[PDB]
Write a protein that binds this ligand. Structure first.
Ligand code: HEM
Ligand SMILES: N[C@@H](Cc1c[nH]c2c(Cl)cccc12)C(=O)O
Ligand SMILES: [C-]#N
Length: 350
């Protein structure tokens, strides 16, 4: 049914299959060292595979992204025990900055590195803790990432489709079906991840580190390019400064292509602004306008079926401070309000 997912999943799998530093058996030893709080051991383990003589000249994006993944788990780990990795591992920061340059991404691990670029097998999957709850946390993102990426493409495509066309309702229906994967992610997370273990055992690994004289956030599903999708769909012309600062916070952490999608649509009417202007001009007597707006309302419905339960998941974990993305759960309440207001516009048009 979700035929667009496969190409995105295949692009991730290429990085997941890559082990340019031959580090697989080494990174598997990291969870034991974290459990023992063995900081010298963690450093010594990293230095067994950390390149010292620069990056191999044959490397492309895939090899450099894979290398950042493997070094990356050591970054959150070191910071988790109270140490700036750049300060306790000499020669590390030049390597991180070279890998940032090679990938056009930040100089540390991101969500992409620890989830979809990370192999799934028990004898290969990299992990901070090796805990079952961390395994399910990674899985919860793998459920929806490729489907979200397809949904971004569908949103960009829908932007150029007239509400007067039967194509509008059909593309919106298709978009809704990809966005349902976000809901599936949260259901999975609510069922399989203990909030207690998350807060006590996992969360400490997601603190910011300093590289290149600035601070970079640790991995979080907050880094998924959902905010780019909604920037195009409804948010691009919002004047809420807090919402704007939220989006611009994560921009460095998403694929270059999605930064470029974000830039293309900024300061310009969002999809629903255009769609509603068109509905106003043409009238809801037009059958394709009615169907298009109805299909559009269902898109907001699924966003809200993600966002509202996700808020409860987050509050439950913090019932045991701010996330890895740097916000308290109250920001989530604000984004949720914005989403209801956007759905409200669509439904008043009907
Ligand atoms: C134990 C599990 C989780 C907790 C405790 C949690 C908590 C949070 C927190 C505190 C934020 C605010 C930003 C920050 O400071 O990090 C956030 C944002 C966000 N998270 Fe999660 N989260 C969890 C799982 C997930 C999952 C499984 C997904 C999707 C697969 C997800 C997707 C998002 C998105 C898209 C945002 C941006 C805000 C929004 O779009 O509503 N999170 N989360
Ligand atoms: N940003 C949220 C949840 C979170 C941190 N790391 C994550 C990862 Cl690696 C996957 C999914 C969610 C999270 C928090 O820091 O509590
Ligand atoms: C959720 N990060």
């Amino acid at each position: 049914t979700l035929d667009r997912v496969g190409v995105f999943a295949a692009t991730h799998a290429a990085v997941a299959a890559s082990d340019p530093l031959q580090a697989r058996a080494l990174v598997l030893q990291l969870p034991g060292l974290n459990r023992n709080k063995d900081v010298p051991g963690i450093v010594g383990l990293l230095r067994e595979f950390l390149p010292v003589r620069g990056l191999p000249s044959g490397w492309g994006f895939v090899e450099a992204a894979a290398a950042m993944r493997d070094i990356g788990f050591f970054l959150g780990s070191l910071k988790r025990h109270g140490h700036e990795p750049a300060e306790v591992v000499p020669g590390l920061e030049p390597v991180l900055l070279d890998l940032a340059r090679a990938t056009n991404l930040p100089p540390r691990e991101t969500l992409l590195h620890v989830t979809v670029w990370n192999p799934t097998a028990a004898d290969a999957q990299r992990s901070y803790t090796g805990l079952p709850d961390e395994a399910h946390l990674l899985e919860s993102v793998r459920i929806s990432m490729a489907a979200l990426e397809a949904a971004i493409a569908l949103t960009v495509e829908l932007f150029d489709v007239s509400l007067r066309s039967p194509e509008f309702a059909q593309r919106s229906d298709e978009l809704e079906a990809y966005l349902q994967k976000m809901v599936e992610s949260i259901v999975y997370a609510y069922r399989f991840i203990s909030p207690q273990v998350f807060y006590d055992e996992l969360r400490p690994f997601y603190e910011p580190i300093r590289v290149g004289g600035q601070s970079y956030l640790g991995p979080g599903a907050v880094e998924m390019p959902l905010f780019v999708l909604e920037h195009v769909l409804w948010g691009s012309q919002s004047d809420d400064q807090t919402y704007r600062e939220f989006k611009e916070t994560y921009l460095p952490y998403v694929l270059p292509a999605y930064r470029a999608v974000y830039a293309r649509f900024s300061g310009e009417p969002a999809l629903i602004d255009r769609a509603l202007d068109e509905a106003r001009a043409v009238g809801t007597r037009d059958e394709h306008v009615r169907a298009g707006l109805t299909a559009l309302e269902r898109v907001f419905k699924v966003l809200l079926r993600f966002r509202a339960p996700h808020l409860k998941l987050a509050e439950r974990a913090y019932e045991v401070e701010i996330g890895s993305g740097g916000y308290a759960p109250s920001m989530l309440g604000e984004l949720l309000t914005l989403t209801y207001a956007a759905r409200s516009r669509v439904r008043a048009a009907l």
